[PDB]
């Protein structure tokens, strides 16, 4: 759960994390730097390498759920069973068993490729606040993961 101050600043630079483009480049930017850096990950979701097409489009779908979990910040109970759900469908994804320990370093390159869109909005009290709800959604997945 978030305190009301960290909504508060997930809600607002969400709004410019979304652009106009839903995010859609936020996405490319985390998959694509994801895979560059860990190269083994790439067979996980059975993609070619960072330069795949399929990188764009999941990066994309991710980032338009992340912010319907934002839009549900207001009542952690709908977000948290969302995302749970959507944790359950991962059980049908990907060619590598999905690891629990994959999700720490999605968040490192989900919060660099926030900053790298939004600049000097991603300040010291959002990067505490975007850690957090990643923990929360990224937490709420894992559990339907592995239920
Ligand atoms: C390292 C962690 C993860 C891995 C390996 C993974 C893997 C995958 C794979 C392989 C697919 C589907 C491609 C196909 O349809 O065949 C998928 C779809 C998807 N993933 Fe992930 N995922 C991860 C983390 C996340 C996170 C953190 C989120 C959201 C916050 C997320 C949300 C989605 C969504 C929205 C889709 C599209 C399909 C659907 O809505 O069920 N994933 N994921």
Redesign the pocket.
């Known amino acids: 759960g978030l305190s009301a101050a960290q909504r508060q600043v997930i809600a607002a630079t969400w709004k410019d994390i979304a652009g106009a483009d839903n995010g859609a480049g936020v996405g490319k930017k985390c998959l694509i730097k ?1 895979l560059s850096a860990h190269p083994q ?1 790439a067979a ?3 993609f070619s390498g960072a330069s795949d097409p ?1 990188v764009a489009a ?1 990066g994309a ?2 980032l ?3 912010g319907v ?1 934002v839009s549900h910040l207001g009542d952690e109970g709908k977000m948290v069973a969302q ?1 749970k759900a ?1 944790g359950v ?2 059980k049908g ?3 590598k068993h ?1 690891k629990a320990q ?2 720490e ?2 968040g490192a390159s989900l919060l660099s490729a926030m900053e790298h869109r939004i600049g000097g909005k991603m300040n010291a009290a959002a990067k505490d606040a975007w850690a957090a709800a990643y923990a929360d ?2 937490g709420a ?1 894992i559990s339907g993961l592995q239920s």
Do not use: D, E, T, W
Request: cysteine-free; glycine content about 10%.
């Open positions: 994801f990950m996980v979701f059975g399929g999941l779908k991710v338009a759920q992340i979990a995302m959507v469908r991962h994804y990907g060619n999905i994959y999700f370093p999605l959604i990224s997945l």
